[PDB]
Design a binder for this molecule. Structure first.
Ligand SMILES: [Mg+2]
Ligand SMILES: [Mg+2]
Ligand SMILES: [Mg+2]
Length: 115
RNA sequence: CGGGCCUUGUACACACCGCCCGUCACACCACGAGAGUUUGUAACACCCGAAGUCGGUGAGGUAACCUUUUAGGAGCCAGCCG
């Protein structure tokens, strides 16, 4: 990729994010604005993908909520995320965990790493 | 044709101008059948699997106790797994 696009966008890259990879469990603290009030909704879930480069990098987290799978895809460097905290590092064998979309319950379990 | 007497059969006794059977028509009621539709009951097979007990683990943590004292150790426990 152009150094020029890299240079224009460098200022908007967040530095405060922890290293995570697909299979890690995050709590993503999302700024939310229902009404005029501002509050933090937490989205806890498995990272199922992380694609793209630089300011365009996104990640997707998946949770089962009330018996329904939910995925939220965020720009890595969105200012709408207050913070990300890694709950547990998973042991997976690939970059994209789309096979989890078809699994529920015990079949959908990811082993932890001592990282 | 009307009547009299004996006898006999009779489901007749308003007493044969008696009684009475089945369809058909009409109304109402209950019931059966009926392409189906719908509601519920008790099971069964498989999938999934909470809580909890129990059994594994426990590289993590750990007032009481043993050895010793800045300690290991025992036992305990979170978590994990069945
Ligand atoms: Mg990548
Ligand atoms: Mg005479
Ligand atoms: Mg009927």
């Amino acid at each position: 990729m152009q150094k020029l696009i890299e240079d224009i966008t460098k200022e908007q890259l967040r530095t405060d994010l922890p290293a995570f990879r697909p299979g890690d469990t995050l709590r993503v603290h999302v700024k939310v604005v229902e009404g005029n009030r501002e509050r933090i909704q937490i989205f806890e879930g498995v990272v199922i993908k992380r694609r793209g480069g630089g300011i365009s990098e996104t990640f997707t987290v998946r949770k089962i909520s009330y018996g329904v799978g939910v995925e939220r895809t965020f720009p890595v460097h969105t200012p709408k995320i207050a913070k990300i905290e890694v709950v547990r590092y998973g042991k997976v064998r690939r970059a994209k965990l789309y096979y989890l979309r078809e699994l529920r319950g015990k079949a959908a379990r990811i082993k932890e790493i001592r990282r």
